[PDB]
Design a binder for this molecule. Structure first.
Ligand SMILES: *[C@@H]1O[C@H](CO)[C@@H](O[C@@H]2O[C@H](CO)[C@@H](O)[C@H](O)[C@H]2NC(C)=O)[C@H](O)[C@H]1NC(C)=O
Ligand SMILES: *[C@@H]1O[C@H](CO[C@@H]2O[C@@H](C)[C@@H](O)[C@@H](O)[C@@H]2O)[C@@H](O)[C@H](O)[C@H]1NC(C)=O
Ligand SMILES: *[C@@H]1O[C@H](CO)[C@@H](O)[C@H](O)[C@H]1NC(C)=O
Lengths: 595, 131
């Protein structure tokens, strides 16, 4: 019978045995991630070893089915996907080393402690203590204790592991016939697709860089403005022409500057855009947050969350003493089981985060109508963009009002407009140069443009040029400070958090025109617009069945990233900053440092 | 005497597209395909029963029946209505009232999986007690 028919046999087999083994692997990852205990680690491993076995075997039993010879462009898609992948081309011994390195890096990160030099029995973890310092503190020397303690006492530990890790993931890369791990990753963004729709994986860099250069001015001015204010708080530590000391930025990294809002708000006498204080004054619990998020999603005509979601999500840190993983994730366990894991606290941040994470669950619910192999977001940016679109509508002061978290007599004026677009720049515009640098470093280390004897040299050479951020303390190559960030130690591509950001405005533009919103798009709240709901759901439910380029054309005009809606969102703010900066020195010098 | 009729839909949900339709849905008038009321009083209730699947995706799976082609509401039958003949079947029989049986995953897609078939000659010999 026709080889294409004979390959449908294969696909049908896969799409049955998979949906049991997937769910059972997912169910055991849940338990570990919800109850870290050595016997739940074991069960997790076993079931995932069942999955790995099957998947890597059926990858090879699918390469036997040649792609030119198949004409159905579903069975081509599905097969292509099975075929390609697999950290499977490695020695049983070298596969097993990777996974020890990987699991060690993960748990070194999970369990790292930085210890008061006054009380050696007092010893602090990122979650929950050190991140709380770095988010809340204003004390220059407490920030540096934490910032440095983390890098010196866990980043160092990470360094030898990280070196082996690049060696072996580079091997896994080249033995699946890519150039280096950096290339392996960039191929989430490869489309073969139809005519006029393809995209290669060496154009991601080009286009990331192209679009980043166009951001650089809005970011420079934001930067000027915030170093200007931070001086008011750390005078004698901040040079009005140098980069910004790294420990002072809001995170343990300065991934987002959001937590710098306190100090940089332009018009603070006005009602607080940051609605954390209102939430606490109104006794908002995590249930309240997730309910309100649900209700948003319903108002645009997208489904409410399934009973199973409310039965089995973990929406706070449990009180039974269990040790759990708090890093907020939106699980598709398959078989219609959808959950969230999230140690939620009463913060405009976890409120926006709940909207984001529930957006993930909606793309997840939508594409469950697609064959197992195609039920993934189009690229890794799409998934996180759909999430951030919800935050875009849910953070606008208008929606804040109608929720209750702004007093009933509230009315926008040009001062609160600027307030909003500053916070939403700290969070959005701020993370753009961080995300580009971290991954340029990674991609270049992977290419081997950067040898081991420059790993921390180039890092802080690039962090000072691209990002405008300076180590407070010298770091030799005994450190691996990149691996002091979750995503790096847990082996996750990071460029998704850049592509998400250019898309989330492209998409928002589209939906707002379909929501027949006039006026500035930063005043768009697609809330109550069932028509925009439909338009979004129509992409959501395609999953990976089409190229990501084609999937842009459906909702947005173009078939590639376009930084223009992002520039227009922030144009008000661009003009206020540019005024607010004339008698200031915009840009930095990579030469000054606090030491 | 008095006859009870349990009209039961039992469904299993796995398969290829868990969300699109139920896998199998057996339909039964008292463990048979056909019951005629032969007593003075009768009750009929609809029972929905899922099988265990090891997935909380169950319970977002709703199978229920609809107002069909006939002047009765299923619930109205049990509320002291009166007939001469009344018979219930699983499969379409001649000249019948049809109560269609729709299934749905958490109100996404709706997908009809059978129906309850009612045949009746008006009279004052058979009663529908609700107890
Ligand atoms: C490609 O093949 C799939 C099957 O692998 C086709 O999907 C079928 O489409 C018909 C349309 O009448 C349905 O009745 C079947 O239920 C579908 N699946 C099965 C099980 O065969 C699909 O239409 C084909 N065409 C393309 C290019 O997508
Ligand atoms: C989810 O909502 C259910 C009611 O569904 C509502 O009406 C249907 C037709 C759809 O429009 C749906 O999106 C609406 O929400 C409730 O029965 C169910 O309990 C709700 N589930 C939970 C637990 O949130
Ligand atoms: C946590 O895991 C242990 C086994 O490691 C198990 O006995 C315990 O019941 C689990 N707790 C919960 C509430 O899941």
């Amino acid at each position: 019978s026709t080889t294409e028919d004979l390959a449908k046999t294969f696909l049908e087999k896969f799409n049955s045995e998979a949906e049991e083994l997937s769910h059972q692997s997912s169910l055991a990852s849940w338990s570990y991630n919800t109850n870290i205990t050595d016997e739940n680690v074991q069960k997790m491993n076993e079931a995932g070893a069942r999955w790995s076995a099957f998947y890597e075997e059926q990858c090879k039993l699918a390469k036997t089915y040649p792609l030119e010879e198949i004409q159905n462009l579903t069975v081509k898609r599905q097969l292509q996907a099975l075929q390609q992948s697999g950290s499977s081309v490695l020695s049983a011994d070298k596969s097993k080393r990777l996974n020890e390195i990987l699991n060690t890096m993960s748990t070194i990160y999970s369990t790292g402690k930085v210890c008061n030099p006054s009380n050696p029995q007092e010893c602090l973890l990122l979650e929950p203590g050190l991140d709380a310092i770095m988010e809340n503190s204003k004390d220059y020397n407490q920030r540096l204790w934490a910032w440095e303690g983390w890098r010196s006492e866990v980043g160092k530990q990470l360094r030898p592991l990280y070196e082996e890790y690049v060696v072996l993931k580079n091997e896994m890369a080249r033995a699946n016939n890519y150039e280096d791990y950096g290339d392996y990753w960039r191929g989430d963004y490869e489309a073969e697709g139809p005519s006029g729709y393809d995209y290669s994986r060496d154009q991601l860099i080009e286009d990331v860089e192209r679009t980043f250069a166009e951001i650089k001015p809005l970011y420079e001015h934001l930067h000027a403005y915030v170093r200007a204010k931070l001086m008011d708080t750390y005078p004698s530590h901040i040079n009005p022409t140098g980069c910004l000391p790294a420990h002072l930025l809001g995170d343990m990294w300065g991934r987002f500057w959001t937590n710098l809002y306190s100090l940089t708000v332009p018009f603070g006498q006005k009602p607080n855009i940051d609605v954390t204080d209102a939430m606490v004054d109104q006794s908002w619990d995590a249930k309240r947050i997730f309910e309100e998020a649900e209700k948003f999603f319903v108002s645009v005509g997208l489904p409410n969350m399934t009973q199973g979601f409310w039965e089995n999500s973990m929406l706070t840190e449990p009180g039974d003493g269990r040790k759990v993983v708090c890093h907020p994730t939106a699980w598709d366990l398959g078989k219609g089981d959808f959950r969230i894991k999230m140690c939620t606290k009463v913060t405009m941040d976890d409120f926006l985060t709940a909207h984001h994470e529930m957006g993930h669950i909606q793309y997840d619910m939508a594409y469950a109508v697609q064959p197992y192999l195609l039920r993934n977001g189009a690229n890794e940016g799409f998934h996180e963009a759909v999430g951030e679109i919800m935050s875009l509508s849910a953070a606008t002061p208008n929606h804040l009002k109608a929720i209750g978290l702004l007093p009933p007599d509230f009315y926008e004026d040009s001062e609160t407009e600027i307030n909003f677009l500053l916070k939403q720049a700290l969070t959005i515009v701020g993370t753009l140069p961080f995300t580009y640098m971290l991954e340029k470093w990674r991609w270049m280390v992977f290419k081997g443009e950067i040898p081991k004897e420059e790993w921390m040299k180039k890092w802080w050479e690039m962090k000072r040029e691209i990002v405008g951020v300076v180590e407070p303390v010298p770091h030799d190559e005994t450190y691996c400070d990149p691996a002091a960030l979750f995503h790096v130690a847990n082996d996750y591509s990071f460029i998704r958090y850049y592509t998400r950001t250019i898309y989330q405005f492209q998409f928002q533009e589209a939906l707002c025109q379909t929501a027949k919103h006039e006026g500035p798009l930063h005043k768009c709240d697609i809330s109550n617009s069932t028509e925009a709901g439909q338009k979004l759901l129509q992409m959501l439910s395609l999953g990976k069945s089409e190229p990501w380029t084609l999937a842009l054309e459906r909702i947005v005009g173009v078939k590639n990233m376009d930084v223009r809606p992002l520039l227009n969102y922030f144009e008000p703010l661009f003009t206020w900053l540019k005024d607010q900066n004339k008698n200031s020195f915009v840009g930095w010098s990579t030469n000054w440092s606090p030491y | 005497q008095h006859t009870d009729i349990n009209f039961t839909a039992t469904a299993s949900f796995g398969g290829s597209c868990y969300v699109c339709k139920p896998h199998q849905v057996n339909i039964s008038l008292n463990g048979n395909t056909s019951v005629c009321v032969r007593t003075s009083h009768f009750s009929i209730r609809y029972i929905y029963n899922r099988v265990k699947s090891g997935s909380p995706g169950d319970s977002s799976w709703h199978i229920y029946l609809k107002s069909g082609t006939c002047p009765f509401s299923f619930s109205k039958l049990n509320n002291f209505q009166k007939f001469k003949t009344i018979c219930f079947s699983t499969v379409e029989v001649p000249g019948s009232c049809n109560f269609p049986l729709e299934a749905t995953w958490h109100y996404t897609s709706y997908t009809i999986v059978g129906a309850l078939y009612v045949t009746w000659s008006e009279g004052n010999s058979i009663t529908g007690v609700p107890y």
